[PDB]
Every structure is written in structure tokens, then in C-alpha cells.
Design a protein around this ligand. Structure first.
Ligand SMILES: *Cc1cc2c(cc1C)N[C@]1([C@H](CC=O)c3ccccc3)C(=O)NC(=O)N=C1N2C[C@H](O)[C@H](O)[C@H](O)COP(=O)(O)OP(=O)(O)OC[C@H]1O[C@@H](n2cnc3c(N)ncnc32)[C@H](O)[C@@H]1O
Ligand SMILES: *Cc1cc2c(cc1C)N[C@]1([C@H](CC=O)c3ccccc3)C(=O)NC(=O)N=C1N2C[C@H](O)[C@H](O)[C@H](O)COP(=O)(O)OP(=O)(O)OC[C@H]1O[C@@H](n2cnc3c(N)ncnc32)[C@H](O)[C@@H]1O
Ligand SMILES: CCCCCCCCCCCC[N+](C)(C)CCCS(=O)(=O)O
Ligand SMILES: CCCCCCCCCCCC[N+](C)(C)CCCS(=O)(=O)O
Ligand SMILES: c1ccc2oc(-c3ncc[nH]3)cc2c1
Ligand SMILES: c1ccc2oc(-c3ncc[nH]3)cc2c1
Lengths: 494, 499
């Protein structure tokens, strides 16, 4: 089976790469392991839900590539509900609020919370988006976990508990599991603490009407039989004139170049001839993905709105199975629902239960947090545990344990002879997201066009015009936010 | 191709498992990815060296399973040279010594060093060998790195520097890369700090005459054509009555049971039907192996012995490419040589050089440490960087980063339907070593014999008689070693007295 380029993986990144090469007139083939496209996106349809995203779902301002590609494919977005108040549930009680962060009243606690977010952003400003290993303190920050950084920075338990929730929600991993350098890079490359965590004007702003799975599905529609489902790649041989790619179902493909568009560690499922260079050989064993169950509970009405709650809950404490929720009701106001994530160690702990047992735990939690018996009467339930997936390895994305990013980070996007590397993990802006999958797929495709003499080197990386539909507003701070002292700062001054 | 049991992997563990099963009367096949058996053991033979171990090589007292297996195969051991003095090189200078650790004269520094080793072993005694996640403080210890633990325990930089060399040499990883719970388990399950690090009476005491690769080679000889070389396994299907195992070169094997005798993360190279359970699916992405280049420099004579140095060097400092060496001269006294390890980040950093460039840096280092110009006159050089191996992933063994051993540790040797797990990583005594490979291969084989109804349950785990050729001396302490205070203990005493 001969072609110009074989793309390994039919997620957003693989599809985005294959579309760009196809549009330029090359013959492309996509080899997809699953019986479906979309990868870490997956939209389920049935009569009870109409459609529901069980994988990645949210898009927001500054994510211009995914918004442009989806629009071209005929998709529209709608705004996640944030009309009414958010809730922070702390020590068994609900506190309603508005804004990026829940209010803090104790003056010492206030200084400590303010300093924490401000310091994460100050640190990020020294970390290059395209080369975090070049931060002036790269080794110092990479050799400690986020747990150790929080222990140093947070003088109050209140700030440490909220910081921990923040880490667990952003990267589906425990603070002690991940490098401080890598985590600080991850926040900075999504535009900072406010942008990453916000609904209005942030990464949770919007969802696609009909589901995000439609991105990969609609590219597969364009490409037709160029997409081969149930073709897990098992072997890549670069010792001859053309590259040879073999699948598990005993097919052989021959191409001038390959794009690897799978999570980095899933490169281990492929046997290489000749062997990979030593730094990549070891890198792909050092880069796990996080752990999460995404759970959606359906109700007759969006009853929380009647109490002036929008459906967003930030829920602290070990006993709560879900630490974060958003309203998942359709833009038409029907199929009322709450989406929640079971994060990191809780995904491992609660996976032992039945689906019915998890539904009961969630409904009882939401009844307490929303202060409503209506939460105890679900009409339907859907969930997906991404820890189970052989061809994802987890969700949302790959995290770096201490020491790995500085030692192996340079390897991620370095070509290996005629194999180029896409996948959201290789992006420089919203890596981890659907936005990063588009950036990395289109960049890896343009590296091949450049290697073919079709475009100049300065066209490999390309800027994206801002979406007219989803424009970004500036992120601002107040004089007091910028200048109030930290807790040890107020002590040095006393 | 039909059989009772397919063993995936022909290193020591898979070879020990296959031998046990074969001896019990079962039909076994070994599917080995490489064109050779032995895996993380590899004995090179050529005219310049005669033979030389480029992978695992040392055995010692308390490693009774590997000693028994090797003896039965007709192999002999000899003692690594420790006749003359050891050297500790720190801050640019060499200090000769004898004993498990260089002597410390400053009384405050002495308290801190004594307390450090003592405390590592005290903590280890809280950790069950067969279940480290059951330690009372397992979560607390697993949620910090070894670097954080050294920062807390060591009240002198001298102790922290030495402990850092200790961690790097024991597990070919950095202190900040590894879980404190996992590292404390690893040391305890090798018999403790003295036993793991010693030559005489420890893990470095002996080598096999002719090389350790003979263990795997001689078992292949016993098994004949049951060992299939250049058969990398790509696919295991358990949806039917018999297990189906497919190889890369397009062959199919059918068996009642399978033993996976490969490093845990190399399980990712196999596509599973049905998919693995979620805990194992994630576990095999969380367990990297360490990084090392093993380097042997050959000389006309063992010239260091004439200066009353045995060849053992503990070398501190970033600029030193090699942090630990042993005399590698043949027991006959010829093919004089120094073996050195390039460890952890230095294996990555120095892999960029040529073989000739690395030889030059090693000779220049040895010349300074030994105060000997003769070190600049090598006659031959061999090396192996284990980081480059597709079918090993690194050496010596698998390490666990913070948080992993408590969350996923119980999965490591849990059977998946009809797949059982061997490999040194699943051992409970000298896991990471050739000893642990034998323990795990024989244990997994006996799990299958029990599943077939051939042996009762209490025979799955079996004790090993002590070697009569290499018996173990106990590790002892003195009254003062046991009861002298730590540095903060002493400060507490001072505070109390002066109150
Ligand atoms: C799973 C999951 C993902 C995301 C979210 C939630 C879940 C449960 N959430 C999103 C955000 C992540 C933040 O960090 C988010 C969370 C919370 C609030 C706001 C936002 C989300 O809502 N928005 C968003 O943009 N991204 C989210 N999540 C991550 C994205 O889903 C993810 O970034 C992209 O989908 C990744 O795309 P790709 O890089 O294209 O990678 P895959 O989807 O994994 O595709 C790889 C395909 O390759 C196939 N494969 C594997 N191995 C193969 C072999 N050997 N041979 C052939 N094919 C192979 C595999 O099957 C895939 O199809
Ligand atoms: C590499 C290396 C290993 C060891 C040492 C040094 C090096 C450079 N040193 C040893 C000590 C380790 C201490 O922690 C030590 C160090 C310093 C001072 C004293 C002692 C040593 O000297 N003694 C010792 O006992 N062990 C050492 N090292 C570790 C051992 O080499 C290792 O423990 C065993 O060899 C492991 O045996 P196995 O569990 O059987 O595992 P492998 O050897 O890796 O065999 C697996 C085989 O599987 C094949 N494979 C892989 N993937 C396959 C697929 N998909 N299909 C089929 N076959 C597959 C692979 O090719 C292997 O042959
Ligand atoms: C004359 C009185 C002097 C008292 C000295 C006050 C020091 C008290 C220690 C409290 C530790 C608080 N945390 C946040 C855990 C560590 C801070 C990290 S760091 O100290 O900035 O490194
Ligand atoms: C007479 C008492 C006065 C003491 C007051 C001085 C403060 C001492 C701080 C030194 C830190 C030493 N290290 C080893 C880095 C950390 C130890 C961790 S732990 O404190 O033992 O938990
Ligand atoms: C810690 C953990 C979760 C969090 O969610 C927010 C938030 N959501 C929408 C506006 N701010 C802020 C926040 C902080
Ligand atoms: C830290 C690093 C390496 C080391 O080697 C020893 C040792 N070797 C032989 C007897 N003791 C002790 C020791 C401590």
C-alpha cells in the first residue's frame, strides 16, 4: 500500500496533519488503532442525552487554531452556563461567589492566597513556552515536586488545600507526582492561572454544539477510505529507501515520511528498526498520562439555577468523590445535567465500585453541595474512566515527574530520520488540549512539506489570526493584587 | 505451535522459569526478542579480553538461588580483589581506607553519618519485603523523593554528598527522581545498607568464572530448540480457550498459560486482547529503568596493587565521569583492568562523546585518583551503554518515582487471567539482581503448577538453603553505633542541660 505520508493516529492532531497534507496535494493514509476516530475526544449519542462529550469538550479564547478548524468543518460553539453564582464547598459548607478565585476573608489567609497565584505567574514569566528546559532555574525547579513547592510557598493550610485542588484539576495528577518546572510551564503556556481556570474568558468558556468528536469524524468524512480503522501500528522500518509501516492485522504501508500523532509513551507499542536513538528510547518510558473519570448526571430540570447557582462547584476534602463540576445542560435549556471529574488517586480508588454505586455517591454529594433534595433523583447517568484505555494511557495528557523535563524534554519533537512528531504533548500553546493537538499536527505536517522542498523554513511555524466568534479579553490585576506582601514579606516588615 | 507454557523473555528469570517447568515434565517454549539469551546479562568474548561481563556480573552472600542455579549448571565463582586499600576521593583529593564506609573523624560529622545509615536501616525494618505499600507510613514516605529525605536527615553536607553517591550507585537514578519509600524498600530487601554496598560479605563479593551470560546460555543448551531467538512478542490474545501469542516475524504460539519475564514497562510493546485491567494498563507507563554505561579499561599490569590500592574507588564531584570502580583483573592475575560505572545523568550527558573520548576522560580521572601516570597508558577498552537497548529500557532495573509504589505496587505480580509475571522486578529478596530474577522465575512457574493442580498452594513460595560455598556473615553493630545520638538528638541534650 504506497503513499506519500502515513499518519499514525486518528485523534485531532493526526487528523489535522492529514487534512493539511491532503489539501496540499499529497497522498495520505491515517492508521487508527481503534474502531473509531477522535482519540481522547469521544462524543456518545443516544435518545436520553442526545449527544454528550465523554472526553475533551471545552474550548475558549486564545485557542484560535481549534476554533478555526472546527468552523471550517461547519461546527458552532455555545457558552457554558455561568449566569448565576459559583460555589466553593469547604469544611462541609457551601460558600457562593463570583470571579476567578473564591473570596478569602482572614487577612493572613488573604495575603497567602494572593501571593500563591501571583507567584505561579511570576515564575511562569521566566519559562520559555517552546523550551521550558531553558528557564534560568530549570534544574532547581525540575528537581522538586509541586508538593514541595506548595509546602515552601503556602504559609496557610487554606491556600495549600486550594492549590492542591488546582493542580489535581489542571493535570489529573497528585502534587507529589509532578515536576514543579513542568507544572509551571503547563500553566504559563495556557496563558497563566486566571486564563486556565476561568469559564468566562478562559479555557472552560465554550463547548461545540453536537460534540467535539465531530472534529475528527468530519475530517474522516473528507478523507474517506484514506482512514484505516482497527489498524494498530506495530512496526516501523527505516532501513530502506521508503519507510515501511506494519499493522497488527497484517497490512504493510510504504511512505516517504511518517507522522507519529499518538501520546509519547504509546510509542512503546511500536517495535523500531533500526532502534530509536537512546534519549528517545528512554524518554517514552518516563512520561505517563493522568487519571480521571468523567461523569455526567442528568436531571429533569437545571434545578440549581432556581437557587441562583450556575452549577460550578469547587469541592474540597478527601471524602468528596468529585472535586469540580460544571453545568452540562444543552444550550436550549433541556437535557439538564451536571458534569463532574473524579480526579487522580480518586479515579483509581473509586474504579472498584459499580456504575450504580458511583452514581449514588455523586448524587448524595451534589445534594449536600447544592443544598437540594432534587439532586437525589437522577433521570440518567453516563461516565468514562480514561485509565482503562489501551490506546490513550489516561487523560487529559502526559505529565512529567521530577527530573524528566530537563533531561529528556528536548527529545519530544526531534525528528527520527523520516518520522516527525505531532500530538498535543508537542505543542507550545495549550499543549494538553485540542488547541495543542491542532498546532502540533499542522506544524509536523509543515516540517514534512519543508523536507520535501515545498515551503521555506520560516513557514514551518505559523501564527493564527484571532477568532472573530470567540475574541479574548485582557487578563487584568489590581494594584493591591500586584503589591500586597506575602506572609513572610509581612514578617520581614515586622 | 502448541505447548503447555510460553515464556516471554530469555533472560535469567524466563530461563529459570522454563527450566523448572521443563524439569516438571511440561512442554515449554521461550520466545526471545534478541539474537541471544541473557538479557541484562551479556558476556563479550574476544582475544583482547578473553571474556568480560558488560551487564550484570556480581554475586554475593545471601544470594542463594543464583548460586545454586549456577552451581547446578557447572559454573564456579571467584572473589573480586579487596586485598589492598579502598579509596574515597572527595573535593579533589584521595583518602585510603578499609571497611564498609570511609572513616569520619569530626565528632559532629561522625554522629550525622552514623545516624544516616542507622536511620535508613531503621526505616527499612518498617517495610514488609513482600508488600512495601503496607508500611505504617507508606503514603508519607512514598510522597517524597530521596532528595527530600536526605535534606531532612543529613545535618552535614558531608553526609548528604556520600548518601547521594550511595543512591546513584545502588539504583542508577538521581535522588530527586526516586520515591523514598521505594528506595528504602529496595535497600532493605537486599539485607540493608552494609550488605548492599560491601565487597567482602556483600553484593559485590564475587563474579562467575567465564561470565554470567553462561547461566542463560547453559539453560538454552538444556532446552534445545525450545528457545526461539529473534521472536519479539507483539500480541497476546486470551479471548479463547487456549492463549494465543504472536511474534513480530509472523509466528503463532498456542499455550495453556503465559509467563511474562520482561521488565514491567516493556509490557507496553505487546498489544493485549482483551485490554489489560486499568491498574496494570497505567502501571506499565509509570515504571522507568535507570541509566548507566559500564566501562572497562585494560592495562599491562594491575599497577594500583603496587601502591597498596585494591582498585575500589568512591569518587565524588560533578566533573568525575565515573563515581565507582572495582578491580576487574582475571583471577589468574592477567588481563589487568578497572571496571567503572557512568551513572544516572552522566550516562545521558556523556553518551554524546565518542568511545575514544570517554576512554580519555576515564584514564585522566583514574590517573588523578590513583596518583598514577600509568593510568594514562591503557592497552584496550570495552563499554556498553544500556540506555540504548530497545529490549531492556535501561539498567540495572526499574525505579519507582514518587507516589507510584503505593498506588500501583500491588499490581506488579498479580496474574491477568492466564498470564503470570516473572522478572527480577517482581522478586521479594534482591529484586533488581540476578538473584531476584531466579526467585521470580521459579515462583511464577510454581504459580502455574498450582493452577494445573500439580502442587499445593504452600509450595508456590519456597525458601532456599544457604550456599555452603558462599556463606553469609551476619551484619553487626556496636553499642555506640546503636545508641549515639543524631545531631538533633545531641542539640536536644544540650538545650536540656543548659535549661
Ligand atoms: C480524556 C479527556 C481529555 C480532555 C479533557 C477531559 C478528558 C476526560 N478535557 C479537555 C481539557 C484538558 C486540560 O488540560 C480541560 C479540562 C478541564 C477544563 C477545561 C479543559 C477539554 O475540555 N478541552 C480540551 O481542549 N482538551 C481536553 N482534554 C484533552 C484533549 O482531549 C486532548 O488534548 C486531545 O484530544 C489530544 O489529541 P491528540 O494529540 O490527537 O491525541 P489522541 O486524542 O490521544 O489521538 C491519538 C490517536 O492515536 C491512536 N493510537 C494509539 N496508538 C496507536 C497505534 N499504535 N497505532 C495506530 N493508532 C494508535 C489512538 O487510538 C488515538 O485515536
Ligand atoms: C545492565 C546491568 C545490570 C546489572 C548490573 C549492571 C548492569 C550494567 N549490575 C548487577 C547489580 C545491580 C544492583 O542493583 C550490581 C551493581 C553494582 C554492584 C553490585 C551489583 C550485578 O553485578 N549483579 C546482579 O545480580 N545484577 C546486576 N544487574 C541487574 C541484572 O542484570 C538483572 O537483574 C537481571 O539480568 C534481570 O533478569 P530478568 O528479570 O530475566 O530480565 P532481562 O535480563 O531484562 O530479560 C528479559 C528478556 O526479555 C527479552 N524481551 C524484551 N521484550 C521482549 C518481547 N516483547 N518479546 C520477547 N522477548 C522480549 C529481552 O531481550 C531479555 O532477554
Ligand atoms: C525570631 C523568630 C524567628 C522565627 C523564624 C520563622 C520560621 C518559621 C518556619 C515556618 C515554616 C513555614 N513553611 C511555609 C512551611 C515553610 C516556609 C518556607 S521558607 O522558610 O521560606 O523556606
Ligand atoms: C537548640 C535548637 C535550636 C534550633 C533552631 C535552628 C533551626 C534549625 C534548622 C536547621 C535545618 C536542618 N536540616 C537538616 C536542613 C533540616 C532538618 C529537618 S527537621 O527540622 O529535623 O525536621
Ligand atoms: C482551584 C481549583 C478549582 C478552581 O476553579 C476556579 C474557577 N472556576 C471558574 C472560575 N474560577 C478556581 C479554582 C481554584
Ligand atoms: C557510598 C557510595 C559508594 C560506596 O561504596 C562503599 C563500599 N564499597 C566497598 C565497601 N564499601 C560505600 C559506599 C558509600
Amino acid at each position: 500500500n504506497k503513499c506519500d505520508v502515513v499518519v499514525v493516529g486518528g485523534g485531532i492532531s493526526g487528523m489535522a496533519a492529514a487534512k493539511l497534507l491532503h489539501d496540499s496535494g499529497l497522498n495520505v493514509v491515517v492508521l487508527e488503532a481503534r474502531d473509531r476516530v477522535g482519540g481522547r475526544t469521544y462524543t456518545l449519542r443516544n435518545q436520553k442525552v442526545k449527544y454528550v462529550d465523554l472526553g475533551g469538550s471545552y474550548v475558549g479564547p486564545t485557542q484560535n487554531r481549534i476554533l478555526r478548524l472546527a468552523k471550517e468543518l461547519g461546527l458552532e460553539t455555545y457558552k457554558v452556563n455561568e449566569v448565576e453564582r459559583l460555589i466553593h464547598h469547604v469544611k462541609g459548607k457551601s460558600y457562593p461567589f463570583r470571579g476567578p478565585f473564591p473570596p478569602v476573608w482572614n487577612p493572613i489567609t488573604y495575603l497567602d492566597h494572593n501571593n500563591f497565584w501571583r507567584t505561579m505567574d511570576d515564575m511562569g514569566r521566566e519559562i520559555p513556552s517552546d523550551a521550558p528546559w531553558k528557564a534560568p532555574l530549570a534544574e532547581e525547579w525540575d528537581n522538586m515536586t509541586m508538593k514541595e513547592l506548595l509546602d515552601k510557598l503556602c504559609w496557610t493550610e487554606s491556600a495549600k488545600q486550594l492549590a492542591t485542588l488546582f493542580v489535581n484539576l489542571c493535570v489529573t495528577a497528585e502534587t507529589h507526582e509532578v515536576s514543579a518546572l513542568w507544572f509551571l510551564w503547563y500553566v504559563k503556556q495556557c496563558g497563566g492561572t486566571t486564563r486556565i481556570i476561568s469559564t468566562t474568558n478562559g479555557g472552560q468558556e465554550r463547548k461545540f454544539v453536537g460534540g467535539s468528536g465531530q472534529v475528527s469524524e468530519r475530517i474522516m468524512d473528507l478523507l474517506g477510505d484514506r482512514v484505516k480503522l482497527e489498524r494498530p501500528v506495530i512496526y516501523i522500518d527505516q532501513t530502506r529507501e521508503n519507510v515501511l509501516v506494519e499493522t497488527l492485522n497484517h497490512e504493510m504501508y510504504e511512505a516517504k515520511y511518517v507522522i507519529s500523532a499518538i501520546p509519547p509513551t504509546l510509542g512503546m507499542k511500536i517495535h523500531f528498526n533500526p532502534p530509536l536513538p537512546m534519549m528517545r528510547n528512554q524518554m517514552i518510558t518516563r512520561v505517563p498520562l493522568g487519571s480521571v473519570i468523567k461523569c455526567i448526571v442528568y436531571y429533569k430540570e437545571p434545578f440549581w439555577r432556581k437557587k441562583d447557582y450556575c452549577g460550578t462547584m469547587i469541592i474540597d476534602g478527601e471524602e468528596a468523590p468529585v472535586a469540580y463540576t460544571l453545568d452540562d445542560t444543552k444550550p436550549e435549556g433541556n437535557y439538564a445535567a451536571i458534569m463532574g471529574f473524579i480526579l487522580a488517586h480518586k479515579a483509581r480508588k473509586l474504579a472498584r465500585l459499580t456504575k450504580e454505586e458511583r452514581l449514588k455517591k455523586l448524587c448524595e454529594l451534589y445534594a449536600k453541595v447544592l443544598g437540594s433534595l432534587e439532586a437525589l433523583e437522577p433521570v440518567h447517568y453516563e461516565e468514562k474512566n480514561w485509565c482503562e484505555e489501551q490506546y490513550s494511557g489516561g487523560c487529559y495528557t502526559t505529565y512529567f515527574p521530577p527530573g524528566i523535563l530537563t533531561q529528556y524534554g528536548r527529545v519530544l519533537r526531534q525528528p527520527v530520520d523520516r518520522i516527525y512528531f505531532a500530538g498535543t504533548e508537542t505543542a507550545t500553546h495549550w499543549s494538553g488540549y485540542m488547541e495543542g493537538a491542532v498546532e502540533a499536527g499542522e506544524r509536523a505536517a509543515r516540517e514534512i512539506l519543508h523536507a520535501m522542498g515545498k515551503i521555506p523554513e520560516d513557514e514551518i511555524w505559523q501564527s493564527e489570526p484571532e477568532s472573530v466568534d470567540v475574541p479574548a479579553q485582557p487578563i487584568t490585576t489590581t494594584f493591591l493584587e500586584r503589591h500586597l506582601p506575602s506572609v513572610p514579606g509581612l514578617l520581614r516588615l515586622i
